[PDB]
Design an enzyme around this catalytic site. Structure first.
Site, short mmCIF file in Angstrom:
data_model
loop_
_atom_site.label_atom_id
_atom_site.label_comp_id
_atom_site.label_asym_id
_atom_site.label_seq_id
_atom_site.Cartn_x
_atom_site.Cartn_y
_atom_site.Cartn_z
N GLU A 1 -107.40 43.22 131.51
CA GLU A 1 -106.36 44.23 131.63
C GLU A 1 -106.21 44.96 130.30
OE1 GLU A 1 -105.01 45.14 134.28
OE2 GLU A 1 -103.39 46.49 133.64
N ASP A 2 -105.80 46.24 130.38
CA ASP A 2 -105.60 47.05 129.18
C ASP A 2 -104.22 46.84 128.58
OD1 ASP A 2 -104.56 48.22 131.52
OD2 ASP A 2 -104.75 50.27 130.76
N1 LIG Z 1 -99.78 55.11 128.93
C1 LIG Z 1 -98.82 54.00 129.08
N2 LIG Z 1 -98.47 53.53 130.42
C2 LIG Z 1 -97.49 52.41 130.57
C3 LIG Z 1 -96.92 51.82 129.48
N3 LIG Z 1 -96.10 50.86 129.93
C4 LIG Z 1 -96.16 50.86 131.25
N4 LIG Z 1 -97.03 51.82 131.65
C5 LIG Z 1 -97.40 52.20 132.92
C6 LIG Z 1 -96.28 51.91 133.94
C7 LIG Z 1 -96.71 50.91 134.71
C8 LIG Z 1 -97.07 51.38 136.11
O1 LIG Z 1 -97.43 50.30 136.93
N5 LIG Z 1 -98.09 50.39 134.07
C9 LIG Z 1 -98.69 49.04 134.16
O2 LIG Z 1 -99.75 48.88 133.59
C10 LIG Z 1 -98.02 47.88 135.01
C11 LIG Z 1 -98.34 46.59 134.23
P1 LIG Z 1 -96.94 45.33 134.18
O3 LIG Z 1 -95.64 46.00 133.73
O4 LIG Z 1 -96.79 44.75 135.60
O5 LIG Z 1 -97.28 44.22 133.23
C12 LIG Z 1 -98.63 51.40 133.42
C13 LIG Z 1 -97.29 52.31 128.07
O6 LIG Z 1 -96.79 51.81 127.10
N6 LIG Z 1 -98.22 53.39 127.92
MG LIG Z 2 -104.45 48.55 133.71
#
Ligand SMILES: Nc1nc2c(ncn2[C@@H]2C[C@@H](CO)N(C(=O)CCP(=O)(O)O)C2)c(=O)[nH]1
Ligand SMILES: [Mg+2]
Ligand SMILES: Nc1nc2c(ncn2[C@@H]2C[C@@H](CO)N(C(=O)CCP(=O)(O)O)C2)c(=O)[nH]1
Ligand SMILES: Nc1nc2c(ncn2[C@@H]2C[C@@H](CO)N(C(=O)CCP(=O)(O)O)C2)c(=O)[nH]1
Ligand SMILES: Nc1nc2c(ncn2[C@@H]2C[C@@H](CO)N(C(=O)CCP(=O)(O)O)C2)c(=O)[nH]1
Ligand SMILES: [Mg+2]
Ligand SMILES: [Mg+2]
Ligand SMILES: [Mg+2]
Lengths: 194, 194, 194, 194
Positions: free
Chosen positions: A110-111
């Site tokens: 995961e990123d």
């Molecule tokens: N570019 C950027 N996008 C973000 C950041 N934080 C959250 N998101 C988005 C919102 C959400 C949507 O689903 N995302 C997840 O990856 C869920 C992983 P979970 O919360 O279940 O661990 C991506 C950030 O800091 N930067």
């Molecule tokens: Mg991701």
């Protein structure tokens, strides 16, 4: 280890100290992780993974709608390690989005991990197919009160609770030509909104 | 600017967070500047060079010895800027140890500035051959108290007064294969003491 | 081995198949070796060097006239080999142009060998100081009737008798930003004549 | 253009000329395309893509389960181009295994085109959703009489009809750590048939 910890008090880097695409000058607040530091940390993650799971075949899984770029670099580093071992180690790469997993070593890549819900859910699914070993590697783990408390096996960086972009982390399809992990500015937040 | 400032209170990076050669495990204390981070800064440094000196034929002088790696990386980034410029830009490279410079933009590329006496001597001489312009780029500037107070034009990193090795910075011909800039350890200096 | 042989039957590569700076479009005829091919061959050259010079401390010697770029890339691949040798390996790097060579393996690095008279001359002077071993690595060896018969110990590429530019090979300070080894055009050789 | 044409008479490169993982020594016959040459060509393809359809927003479709390595690299080069374009170019990156595409510039990215029945089929589906345009980029096109006649819009290499592995081309999930495109040997053919 919690990885490289960028504390809440660390401001980051001035945009002027590093190369930034000009069309993003007003869109970014500051640079947290230069592209080069991400690579140096990712190379070390590849060695931790291979030392712990790389003995044999693994199934590496990239979670879609995420950081394909970090999956690609991490797999590049893993391949370089295999390229200098004495064994030909096969490797399955697949993409998952929320049967042959049973009996294999599964690395989930995961990123970003924000609240941790996505990963918490994903593991329950994968573990119902009973694999010998399922490990998670995340580039960034955000320190957030909104977090359910999950702790990945392998952590690139632990960053403060700020909305970050660049390298693997788009924002409504923008910022994928940005290779540094920066904090988005309100001007950019509203500029590329959907 | 003073460059990327690394303060006296910042510990550095634990060695377990990056890939370091095994045989140097006990020879280092801390990673100050990972290789990838050096590259990011150097790329912007190159843009700064072409901004102040892109108007005349530049002569790039590498100071010997032991400062060649940074020289190669910096010129790679400068050349990548010239190949994107849409014009045929000639550029002279040369090496110097303690008539073409006449009327050209002379870039003195140094890896480390400690006392500053080296760069002080070199400037006085280079200016005699009446160049159009003389600037100094230095990857590292040490906050050493023995400094005679000289500030270069382009600085990669302003670092504490610690003995550092890696990337371009050797010690008795050792550590050349280390890509990060790290502080040497007491075991380090003793083991490889010439 | 003679290296990677590019025969007289081969017209190399059409210019429009690769990224060449636009300001060099009319100044070139064909591309003989793309930058990526140079690097892959150079990585193998680094292995061949270590396989028969890795027992004693190496003095790497760069002949000043143009080979600096290729010197830097070859040294980086050597350093990568040592990084993974689990042994601290010192190495000297100096520069030579038209004393401490008492008894170490001397490695002379050159970009191009045309007639071979430069290497013949240099090896006569260096062997005077009686080193343990002196070896020559060249990126290009031209297939030229003007050859005095000198063949280096390590050869990157054996090419036809054409005036080439790009990567390490400049022409009156022009083509430095050109990354591939390409044949110069008559329009190009007149445009930049000194 | 048909890309870089590797003739049927061309033998490829002897394995001794490049760095090859030792565990594959007996599993390959010749090297057709060194990794670096792939990159130099892929860089040119990224420029051809952007000039033709990269003015605006593109959807990049990687075909699974093929060569994500090539997809990742072509997109690294695309991003590097956008990074200097003075415009925030949004891009969609998705994967597909054989409505959001409607009115969009759609680029299909494939590693290898053998018979062409995959692209012929894939294009017929995509063309029903009314994209602004759909173009195919394939790293390798095999010259085979088994070909249905389809020729992609962007071709990296036109290669003979032999079985190739390395870079994005696996064989039962082996050869993923080999970075060159090489012809598998009949030994390797049945060694990893698994
Ligand atoms: N570019 C950027 N996008 C973000 C950041 N934080 C959250 N998101 C988005 C919102 C959400 C949507 O689903 N995302 C997840 O990856 C869920 C992983 P979970 O919360 O279940 O661990 C991506 C950030 O800091 N930067
Ligand atoms: Mg991701
Ligand atoms: N590896 C490593 N070598 C260091 C460091 N500091 C000093 N040296 C040595 C000693 C000194 C020459 O006596 N050098 C200079 O470059 C003169 C620059 P000056 O003092 O004239 O400004 C190299 C360090 O931190 N790391
Ligand atoms: N850019 C470019 N320059 C070339 C090429 N051939 C010759 N030169 C020049 C001329 C000659 C005289 O100094 N040079 C040497 O390097 C002596 C090597 P020797 O003949 O002693 O073995 C450089 C070429 O093909 N391309
Ligand atoms: N490693 C490697 N695999 C190869 C090669 N040729 C064919 N394949 C396999 C077989 C076939 C079936 O799935 N593939 C396709 O990609 C369909 C493309 P189509 O025929 O529809 O155009 C992959 C080769 O040369 N090397
Ligand atoms: Mg120095
Ligand atoms: Mg030369
Ligand atoms: Mg495929």
């Amino acid at each position: 280890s919690p990885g490289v910890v960028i504390s809440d008090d660390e401001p980051g880097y001035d945009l002027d100290l590093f190369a930034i695409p000009n069309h993003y000058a007003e869109d970014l607040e500051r640079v947290f992780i230069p592209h080069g530091l991400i690579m140096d940390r990712t190379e070390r993650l590849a060695r931790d993974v291979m030392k712990e799971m790389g003995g044999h075949h693994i199934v590496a899984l990239c979670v879609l709608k995420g950081g394909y770029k970090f999956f690609a670099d991490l797999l590049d580093y893993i391949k370089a390690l295999n390229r200098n071992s004495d064994r030909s180690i096969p490797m399955t790469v697949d993409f998952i989005r929320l049967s042959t997993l049973t009996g294999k070593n599964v690395l989930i890549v995961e990123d970003i991990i924000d609240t941790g819900k996505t990963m918490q859910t994903l593991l329950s699914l994968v573990r119902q197919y009973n694999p010998k070993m399922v490990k998670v590697a995340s580039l960034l783990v955000k320190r957030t009160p909104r977090s359910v408390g999950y702790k990945p096996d392998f952590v690139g960086f632990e960053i403060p609770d700020k909305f970050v972009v660049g390298y693997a982390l788009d924002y409504n399809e923008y910022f994928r030509d940005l290779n540094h992990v920066a904090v988005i500015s309100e001007t950019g937040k509203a500029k590329y909104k959907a």
